Amino acid sequence: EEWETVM
Amino acid sequence: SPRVVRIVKSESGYGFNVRGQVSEGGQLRSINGELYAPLQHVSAVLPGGAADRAGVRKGDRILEVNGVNVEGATHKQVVDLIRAGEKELILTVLSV
């Protein structure tokens, strides 16, 4: 399971 | 080889996305032929944004955030570390 976040 | 980048936040952020595993740990995977536990990575760089200007590149693997080792770290740990500073971010990254 992978997650992406805008920084 | 690992390198350190310093990034100053704009009102709209640091200008990159981070992507990787939710869980802690996992199978080793080499990055440029060196063994590491799983690493979060840079999945997008805003053209002209702070990360771009500081030399962060698409695909860069993240070894440290603000002086804290994040080898094998959860996605949440890395996001929280990126958010730790009011306006400055220091990363140790590995380009692929």
CSV table of all heavy atoms in Angstrom, one decimal, chain B residues 38-88:
chain,number,residue,atom,x,y,z
B,38,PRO,N,13.0,0.0,2.7
B,38,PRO,CA,12.2,0.8,1.8
B,38,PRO,C,12.3,2.3,2.1
B,38,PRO,O,12.2,2.8,3.2
B,38,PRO,CB,10.8,0.3,2.0
B,38,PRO,CG,11.0,-1.2,2.3
B,38,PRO,CD,12.2,-1.1,3.2
B,39,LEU,N,12.4,3.1,1.0
B,39,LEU,CA,12.4,4.6,1.1
B,39,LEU,C,11.3,5.2,0.4
B,39,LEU,O,10.9,4.8,-0.6
B,39,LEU,CB,13.7,5.1,0.4
B,39,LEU,CG,15.0,4.5,0.9
B,39,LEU,CD1,16.2,5.0,0.2
B,39,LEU,CD2,15.2,4.7,2.4
B,40,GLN,N,10.7,6.3,1.1
B,40,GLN,CA,9.8,7.2,0.4
B,40,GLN,C,10.6,7.9,-0.7
B,40,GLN,O,11.8,8.0,-0.7
B,40,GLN,CB,9.3,8.2,1.4
B,40,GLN,CG,8.7,7.6,2.7
B,40,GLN,CD,7.3,6.9,2.5
B,40,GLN,OE1,6.5,7.4,1.7
B,40,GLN,NE2,7.1,5.8,3.2
B,41,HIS,N,9.8,8.4,-1.7
B,41,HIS,CA,10.5,9.1,-2.8
B,41,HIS,C,9.7,10.3,-3.3
B,41,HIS,O,8.5,10.4,-3.0
B,41,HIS,CB,10.8,8.1,-4.0
B,41,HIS,CG,9.6,7.8,-4.8
B,41,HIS,ND1,8.8,6.7,-4.5
B,41,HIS,CD2,9.2,8.3,-5.9
B,41,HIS,CE1,7.8,6.6,-5.4
B,41,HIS,NE2,8.0,7.6,-6.3
B,42,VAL,N,10.4,11.1,-4.1
B,42,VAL,CA,9.8,12.3,-4.7
B,42,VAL,C,9.1,11.9,-6.0
B,42,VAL,O,9.7,11.4,-6.9
B,42,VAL,CB,10.8,13.4,-5.0
B,42,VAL,CG1,10.2,14.5,-5.7
B,42,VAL,CG2,11.5,13.8,-3.7
B,43,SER,N,7.7,12.0,-6.0
B,43,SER,CA,6.9,11.5,-7.1
B,43,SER,C,6.5,12.7,-8.0
B,43,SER,O,5.9,12.4,-9.1
B,43,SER,CB,5.7,10.9,-6.6
B,43,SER,OG,5.0,11.7,-5.6
B,44,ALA,N,6.8,13.9,-7.7
B,44,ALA,CA,6.5,15.0,-8.5
B,44,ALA,C,7.3,16.2,-8.0
B,44,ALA,O,7.5,16.4,-6.8
B,44,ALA,CB,5.0,15.4,-8.6
B,45,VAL,N,7.8,17.0,-9.0
B,45,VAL,CA,8.4,18.3,-8.7
B,45,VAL,C,7.7,19.4,-9.5
B,45,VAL,O,7.7,19.3,-10.7
B,45,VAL,CB,9.9,18.2,-9.1
B,45,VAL,CG1,10.6,19.6,-8.9
B,45,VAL,CG2,10.6,17.1,-8.3
B,46,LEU,N,7.3,20.4,-8.8
B,46,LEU,CA,6.6,21.6,-9.4
B,46,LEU,C,7.6,22.4,-10.1
B,46,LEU,O,8.6,22.8,-9.6
B,46,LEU,CB,6.0,22.4,-8.3
B,46,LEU,CG,5.4,23.8,-8.7
B,46,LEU,CD1,4.1,23.6,-9.6
B,46,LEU,CD2,5.0,24.6,-7.5
B,47,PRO,N,7.5,22.5,-11.5
B,47,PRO,CA,8.5,23.3,-12.2
B,47,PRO,C,8.6,24.7,-11.7
B,47,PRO,O,7.6,25.4,-11.6
B,47,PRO,CB,7.9,23.3,-13.6
B,47,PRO,CG,7.1,22.0,-13.7
B,47,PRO,CD,6.4,22.0,-12.4
B,48,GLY,N,9.8,25.2,-11.4
B,48,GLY,CA,10.0,26.5,-10.9
B,48,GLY,C,9.7,26.7,-9.4
B,48,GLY,O,9.9,27.8,-8.9
B,49,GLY,N,9.3,25.6,-8.7
B,49,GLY,CA,9.0,25.7,-7.3
B,49,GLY,C,10.2,25.6,-6.5
B,49,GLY,O,11.3,25.5,-7.0
B,50,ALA,N,10.1,25.6,-5.2
B,50,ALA,CA,11.2,25.7,-4.3
B,50,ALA,C,12.1,24.4,-4.4
B,50,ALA,O,13.3,24.5,-4.4
B,50,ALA,CB,10.7,25.9,-2.8
B,51,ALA,N,11.5,23.3,-4.4
B,51,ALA,CA,12.2,22.0,-4.5
B,51,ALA,C,13.0,22.0,-5.8
B,51,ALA,O,14.1,21.6,-5.9
B,51,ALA,CB,11.3,20.8,-4.4
B,52,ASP,N,12.3,22.3,-6.9
B,52,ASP,CA,13.0,22.3,-8.2
B,52,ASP,C,14.2,23.2,-8.2
B,52,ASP,O,15.3,22.8,-8.6
B,52,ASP,CB,12.0,22.9,-9.3
B,52,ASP,CG,12.5,22.7,-10.7
B,52,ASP,OD1,13.4,21.9,-11.0
B,52,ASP,OD2,12.1,23.5,-11.6
B,53,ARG,N,14.1,24.4,-7.7
B,53,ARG,CA,15.2,25.4,-7.6
B,53,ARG,C,16.3,24.9,-6.7
B,53,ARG,O,17.5,25.2,-7.0
B,53,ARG,CB,14.7,26.8,-7.2
B,53,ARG,CG,13.8,27.4,-8.3
B,53,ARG,CD,13.5,28.9,-7.9
B,53,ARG,NE,12.3,29.0,-7.1
B,53,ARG,CZ,12.3,29.1,-5.8
B,53,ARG,NH1,13.4,28.9,-5.1
B,53,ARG,NH2,11.1,29.2,-5.2
B,54,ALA,N,16.0,24.1,-5.7
B,54,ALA,CA,17.0,23.6,-4.8
B,54,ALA,C,17.7,22.3,-5.3
B,54,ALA,O,18.6,21.8,-4.8
B,54,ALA,CB,16.3,23.3,-3.5
B,55,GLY,N,17.2,21.8,-6.5
B,55,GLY,CA,17.8,20.7,-7.2
B,55,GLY,C,17.2,19.4,-6.9
B,55,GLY,O,17.8,18.3,-7.2
B,56,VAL,N,16.0,19.3,-6.3
B,56,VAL,CA,15.3,18.1,-6.1
B,56,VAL,C,14.8,17.6,-7.4
B,56,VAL,O,14.3,18.4,-8.2
B,56,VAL,CB,14.1,18.2,-5.1
B,56,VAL,CG1,13.3,16.9,-5.0
B,56,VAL,CG2,14.6,18.7,-3.7
B,57,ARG,N,14.9,16.3,-7.7
B,57,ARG,CA,14.5,15.7,-8.9
B,57,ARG,C,13.5,14.6,-8.7
B,57,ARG,O,13.4,13.9,-7.7
B,57,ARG,CB,15.7,15.1,-9.6
B,57,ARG,CG,16.8,16.1,-9.9
B,57,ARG,CD,17.9,15.6,-10.8
B,57,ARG,NE,19.0,14.9,-10.1
B,57,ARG,CZ,19.9,15.6,-9.4
B,57,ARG,NH1,19.9,16.9,-9.3
B,57,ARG,NH2,20.9,14.9,-8.8
B,58,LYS,N,12.6,14.5,-9.7
B,58,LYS,CA,11.7,13.4,-9.8
B,58,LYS,C,12.4,12.0,-9.5
B,58,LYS,O,13.5,11.8,-10.1
B,58,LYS,CB,11.1,13.4,-11.2
B,58,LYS,CG,9.9,12.7,-11.4
B,58,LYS,CD,9.4,13.2,-12.7
B,58,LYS,CE,8.4,12.4,-13.2
B,58,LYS,NZ,8.0,12.7,-14.6
B,59,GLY,N,11.8,11.2,-8.7
B,59,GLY,CA,12.4,9.9,-8.4
B,59,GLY,C,13.4,9.9,-7.2
B,59,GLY,O,13.8,8.8,-6.8
B,60,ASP,N,13.8,11.1,-6.7
B,60,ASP,CA,14.8,11.1,-5.6
B,60,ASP,C,14.2,10.3,-4.4
B,60,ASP,O,13.1,10.5,-4.0
B,60,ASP,CB,15.0,12.5,-5.2
B,60,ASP,CG,16.0,13.3,-6.1
B,60,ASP,OD1,16.6,12.7,-7.0
B,60,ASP,OD2,16.2,14.5,-5.8
B,61,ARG,N,15.1,9.5,-3.9
B,61,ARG,CA,14.7,8.7,-2.7
B,61,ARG,C,15.1,9.5,-1.5
B,61,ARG,O,16.2,10.1,-1.5
B,61,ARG,CB,15.4,7.3,-2.8
B,61,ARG,CG,14.4,6.2,-3.2
B,61,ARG,CD,14.0,6.4,-4.7
B,61,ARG,NE,13.0,5.4,-5.0
B,61,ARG,CZ,12.2,5.5,-6.1
B,61,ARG,NH1,12.4,6.4,-7.0
B,61,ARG,NH2,11.3,4.5,-6.3
B,62,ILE,N,14.3,9.5,-0.4
B,62,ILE,CA,14.5,10.3,0.7
B,62,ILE,C,15.1,9.4,1.9
B,62,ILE,O,14.5,8.5,2.3
B,62,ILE,CB,13.2,10.9,1.2
B,62,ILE,CG1,12.6,11.8,0.1
B,62,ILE,CG2,13.5,11.7,2.5
B,62,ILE,CD1,11.2,12.2,0.3
B,63,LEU,N,16.4,9.8,2.3
B,63,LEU,CA,17.1,9.1,3.3
B,63,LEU,C,16.9,9.7,4.7
B,63,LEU,O,16.9,9.0,5.7
B,63,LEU,CB,18.6,9.0,3.0
B,63,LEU,CG,19.0,8.1,1.9
B,63,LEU,CD1,20.4,8.3,1.5
B,63,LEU,CD2,18.8,6.6,2.3
B,64,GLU,N,16.9,11.1,4.7
B,64,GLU,CA,16.7,11.8,6.0
B,64,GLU,C,15.8,13.0,5.7
B,64,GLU,O,15.8,13.6,4.6
B,64,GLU,CB,18.1,12.3,6.5
B,64,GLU,CG,19.1,11.3,6.7
B,64,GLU,CD,20.4,11.9,7.3
B,64,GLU,OE1,20.9,12.9,6.7
B,64,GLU,OE2,20.9,11.5,8.4
B,65,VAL,N,15.1,13.4,6.8
B,65,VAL,CA,14.3,14.6,6.8
B,65,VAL,C,14.6,15.3,8.0
B,65,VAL,O,14.5,14.8,9.1
B,65,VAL,CB,12.8,14.3,6.8
B,65,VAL,CG1,12.0,15.6,6.7
B,65,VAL,CG2,12.4,13.4,5.5
B,66,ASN,N,15.1,16.6,7.9
B,66,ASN,CA,15.4,17.4,9.0
B,66,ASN,C,16.3,16.7,10.0
B,66,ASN,O,16.1,16.9,11.2
B,66,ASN,CB,14.2,18.0,9.6
B,66,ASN,CG,13.5,19.0,8.7
B,66,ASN,OD1,14.1,19.7,8.0
B,66,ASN,ND2,12.1,19.0,8.8
B,67,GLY,N,17.3,16.0,9.5
B,67,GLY,CA,18.3,15.4,10.3
B,67,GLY,C,17.9,14.1,10.9
B,67,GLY,O,18.7,13.5,11.7
B,68,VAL,N,16.8,13.6,10.6
B,68,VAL,CA,16.2,12.3,11.1
B,68,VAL,C,16.2,11.3,10.0
B,68,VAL,O,15.7,11.5,8.9
B,68,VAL,CB,14.8,12.5,11.7
B,68,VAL,CG1,14.2,11.2,12.2
B,68,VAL,CG2,14.8,13.6,12.8
B,69,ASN,N,16.8,10.1,10.3
B,69,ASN,CA,16.9,9.0,9.4
B,69,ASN,C,15.5,8.5,9.2
B,69,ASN,O,14.8,8.2,10.1
B,69,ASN,CB,17.8,7.9,10.0
B,69,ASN,CG,18.1,6.9,9.0
B,69,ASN,OD1,17.2,6.1,8.7
B,69,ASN,ND2,19.2,6.9,8.3
B,70,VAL,N,15.1,8.3,7.9
B,70,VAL,CA,13.8,7.8,7.5
B,70,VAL,C,13.9,6.6,6.7
B,70,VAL,O,13.0,6.2,5.9
B,70,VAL,CB,12.9,8.9,6.9
B,70,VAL,CG1,12.6,10.0,7.9
B,70,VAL,CG2,13.6,9.5,5.7
B,71,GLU,N,15.0,5.9,6.7
B,71,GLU,CA,15.1,4.6,6.1
B,71,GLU,C,14.1,3.7,6.7
B,71,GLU,O,14.0,3.5,7.9
B,71,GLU,CB,16.5,4.0,6.2
B,71,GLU,CG,16.7,2.7,5.4
B,71,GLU,CD,18.2,2.2,5.5
B,71,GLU,OE1,19.1,3.0,5.7
B,71,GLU,OE2,18.4,0.9,5.2
B,72,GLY,N,13.3,3.0,5.8
B,72,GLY,CA,12.2,2.2,6.3
B,72,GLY,C,11.0,2.8,6.9
B,72,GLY,O,10.1,2.2,7.3
B,73,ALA,N,10.9,4.1,6.9
B,73,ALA,CA,9.9,4.9,7.7
B,73,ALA,C,8.5,4.8,7.0
B,73,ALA,O,8.4,4.6,5.8
B,73,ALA,CB,10.3,6.3,7.8
B,74,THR,N,7.5,4.9,7.8
B,74,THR,CA,6.2,5.0,7.3
B,74,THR,C,6.0,6.3,6.5
B,74,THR,O,6.7,7.3,6.8
B,74,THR,CB,5.1,5.0,8.4
B,74,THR,OG1,5.2,6.2,9.2
B,74,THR,CG2,5.3,3.8,9.3
B,75,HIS,N,5.0,6.3,5.7
B,75,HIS,CA,4.7,7.5,4.9
B,75,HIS,C,4.3,8.7,5.9
B,75,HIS,O,4.8,9.8,5.7
B,75,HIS,CB,3.5,7.3,4.0
B,75,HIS,CG,3.2,8.4,3.1
B,75,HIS,ND1,4.0,8.7,2.0
B,75,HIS,CD2,2.3,9.4,3.1
B,75,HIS,CE1,3.5,9.8,1.3
B,75,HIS,NE2,2.5,10.2,2.0
B,76,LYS,N,3.5,8.4,6.9
B,76,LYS,CA,3.1,9.4,7.9
B,76,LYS,C,4.3,10.0,8.6
B,76,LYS,O,4.4,11.2,8.8
B,76,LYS,CB,2.1,8.8,8.9
B,76,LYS,CG,1.8,9.7,10.0
B,76,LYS,CD,0.8,9.1,11.0
B,76,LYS,CE,0.6,10.0,12.2
B,76,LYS,NZ,0.2,11.4,11.8
B,77,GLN,N,5.3,9.1,9.0
B,77,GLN,CA,6.5,9.7,9.6
B,77,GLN,C,7.2,10.7,8.8
B,77,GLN,O,7.6,11.7,9.3
B,77,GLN,CB,7.4,8.5,10.0
B,77,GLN,CG,6.9,7.8,11.2
B,77,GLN,CD,7.6,6.4,11.4
B,77,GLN,OE1,8.3,5.9,10.6
B,77,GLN,NE2,7.3,5.8,12.6
B,78,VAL,N,7.3,10.4,7.5
B,78,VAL,CA,8.0,11.3,6.6
B,78,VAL,C,7.2,12.6,6.4
B,78,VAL,O,7.8,13.6,6.4
B,78,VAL,CB,8.4,10.5,5.3
B,78,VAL,CG1,8.9,11.5,4.2
B,78,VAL,CG2,9.5,9.5,5.6
B,79,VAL,N,5.9,12.4,6.1
B,79,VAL,CA,5.1,13.6,6.0
B,79,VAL,C,5.2,14.5,7.2
B,79,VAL,O,5.4,15.7,7.1
B,79,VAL,CB,3.7,13.2,5.7
B,79,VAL,CG1,2.7,14.4,5.8
B,79,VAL,CG2,3.6,12.6,4.3
B,80,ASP,N,5.1,13.9,8.4
B,80,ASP,CA,5.1,14.7,9.6
B,80,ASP,C,6.5,15.4,9.8
B,80,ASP,O,6.5,16.5,10.2
B,80,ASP,CB,4.8,13.8,10.9
B,80,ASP,CG,3.3,13.4,10.9
B,80,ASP,OD1,2.5,13.9,10.2
B,80,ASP,OD2,3.1,12.5,11.8
B,81,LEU,N,7.6,14.7,9.5
B,81,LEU,CA,8.9,15.3,9.5
B,81,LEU,C,9.0,16.5,8.6
B,81,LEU,O,9.6,17.5,8.9
B,81,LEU,CB,10.0,14.3,9.3
B,81,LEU,CG,10.4,13.5,10.6
B,81,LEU,CD1,11.0,12.2,10.3
B,81,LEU,CD2,11.3,14.3,11.5
B,82,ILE,N,8.5,16.3,7.3
B,82,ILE,CA,8.6,17.4,6.4
B,82,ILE,C,7.8,18.6,6.9
B,82,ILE,O,8.3,19.8,6.7
B,82,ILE,CB,8.0,17.0,5.0
B,82,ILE,CG1,9.0,16.0,4.4
B,82,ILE,CG2,7.8,18.2,4.1
B,82,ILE,CD1,8.3,15.2,3.2
B,83,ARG,N,6.7,18.4,7.6
B,83,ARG,CA,5.9,19.5,8.2
B,83,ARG,C,6.5,20.0,9.5
B,83,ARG,O,5.9,20.9,10.1
B,83,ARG,CB,4.5,19.0,8.4
B,83,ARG,CG,3.7,18.7,7.1
B,83,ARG,CD,2.4,18.1,7.3
B,83,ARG,NE,1.7,17.9,6.1
B,83,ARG,CZ,0.6,17.1,6.0
B,83,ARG,NH1,0.1,16.4,7.0
B,83,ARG,NH2,0.0,17.0,4.8
B,84,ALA,N,7.6,19.5,10.0
B,84,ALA,CA,8.1,19.8,11.4
B,84,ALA,C,8.5,21.3,11.5
B,84,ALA,O,8.4,21.9,12.5
B,84,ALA,CB,9.2,18.9,11.8
B,85,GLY,N,9.2,21.8,10.4
B,85,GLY,CA,9.7,23.1,10.4
B,85,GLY,C,8.7,24.1,10.0
B,85,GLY,O,7.9,23.8,9.2
B,86,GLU,N,8.8,25.3,10.5
B,86,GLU,CA,7.9,26.4,10.1
B,86,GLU,C,8.0,26.7,8.6
B,86,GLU,O,7.0,26.9,7.9
B,86,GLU,CB,8.1,27.7,10.9
B,86,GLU,CG,7.4,27.7,12.2
B,86,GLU,CD,7.7,29.0,13.0
B,86,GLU,OE1,8.8,29.5,12.9
B,86,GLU,OE2,6.7,29.4,13.6
B,87,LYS,N,9.3,26.9,8.1
B,87,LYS,CA,9.4,27.3,6.7
B,87,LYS,C,10.6,26.6,6.0
B,87,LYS,O,10.7,26.7,4.8
B,87,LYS,CB,9.5,28.8,6.6
B,87,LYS,CG,10.7,29.4,7.3
B,87,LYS,CD,10.8,30.9,7.1
B,87,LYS,CE,11.8,31.6,8.0
B,87,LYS,NZ,13.1,30.9,8.0
B,88,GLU,N,11.5,25.9,6.7
B,88,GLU,CA,12.6,25.3,6.1
B,88,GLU,C,12.6,23.8,6.2
B,88,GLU,O,12.2,23.3,7.2
B,88,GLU,CB,13.9,25.9,6.7
B,88,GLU,CG,15.1,25.3,5.9
B,88,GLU,CD,16.4,26.0,6.3
B,88,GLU,OE1,16.4,26.9,7.2
B,88,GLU,OE2,17.5,25.6,5.7
